[PDB]
Design a protein around this ligand. Structure first.
Ligand code: BEF
Length: 280
């Protein structure tokens, strides 16, 4: 509704202009329907959700960032194969400048944080931020995300099948023991969910506008929330899975193929509920 949107926009403005900043009202707003509504609003709100300040604009990239980055060839390759992330209406020139900044953001964060290891798909998170909030803020926000919500993904000692994936099955079991037991016998594992988690579902929801609204939700929530969103998608598809061919090839095949037009607002609700009933 348009009356509701006007009220939500004024409530966001009231929260930004309060003392103290009413961050609690901003999480509520990010969690509730439509999330934060616009990128202009997100440029102000996302840094509050991650508790990052207007700060020393990241001690500049040193000179020769690219020349000293061992991951430059990998990052260049990943970024070049990411054109689909950009509005099809976006002029070629404008897009190629954003690709240049996307490379520099990733490389700068890696250089500032040598304990972090690049992974394929990281650029799907970084480009979303660059498109929403621009290059300086994308850098300081993603850096905060990289050292917290994404750290295990960027840790090569960390075994991603342990850790984050290890939550998915008990979650599904808590809510639907049949589906749990079914997927157990298919020996399907949890690897199917992994691409979703490390790219924050950029290839699960088609509409870029839906993806950014999901980032509102993830930024407002505890860092394990994406696993509950994965769980809720799997549970949504229960019938389709219970009608499957029961093996690691069938089960994988179906779940990996994402339905068009998922009810994201409903699934976002359900992920918050599930989070409450089976917390980390
Ligand atoms: F050009 Be792909 F590496 F098909």
């Amino acid at each position: 509704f348009n009356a509701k949107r006007k009220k939500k926009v004024a409530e966001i403005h009231q929260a930004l202009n309060s003392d103290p900043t009413d961050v609690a009202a901003l999480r509520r707003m990010a969690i509730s329907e439509g999330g934060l509504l616009t990128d202009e609003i997100r440029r102000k709100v996302w840094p509050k959700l991650l508790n990052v300040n207007a700060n020393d604009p990241p001690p500049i990239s040193g000179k020769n960032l690219r020349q000293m980055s061992k991951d430059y060839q990998q990052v260049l390759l990943d970024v070049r194969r990411s054109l689909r992330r950009f509005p099809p209406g976006m002029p070629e020139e404008q897009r190629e400048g954003l690709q240049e900044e996307l490379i520099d953001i990733i490389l700068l964060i890696l250089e500032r944080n040598p304990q972090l290891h690049y992974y394929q798909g990281y650029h799907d998170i970084v480009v979303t931020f660059l498109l929403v909030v621009g290059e300086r803020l994308a850098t300081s926000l993603v850096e905060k995300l990289s050292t917290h919500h994404l750290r295990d993904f960027m840790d090569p000692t960390m075994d991603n099948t342990k850790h984050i994936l290890n939550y998915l099955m008990p979650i599904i079991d808590q809510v639907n023991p049949e589906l749990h037991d079914f997927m157990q016998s298919a020996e399907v594992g949890t690897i199917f969910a992994l691409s979703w988690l490390i790219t924050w579902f950029g290839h699960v929801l088609s509409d870029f506008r839906h993806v950014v609204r999901l980032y509102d939700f993830f930024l407002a929530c505890h860092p394990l929330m994406p696993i509950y969103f994965a769980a809720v998608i799997v549970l949504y598809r229960e019938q389709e899975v219970l009608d499957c061919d029961c093996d690691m090839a069938s089960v994988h095949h179906l779940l990996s193929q994402i339905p068009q037009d998922l009810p994201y607002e409903t699934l976002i609700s359900r992920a918050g509920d599930l989070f409450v009933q089976f917390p980390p």
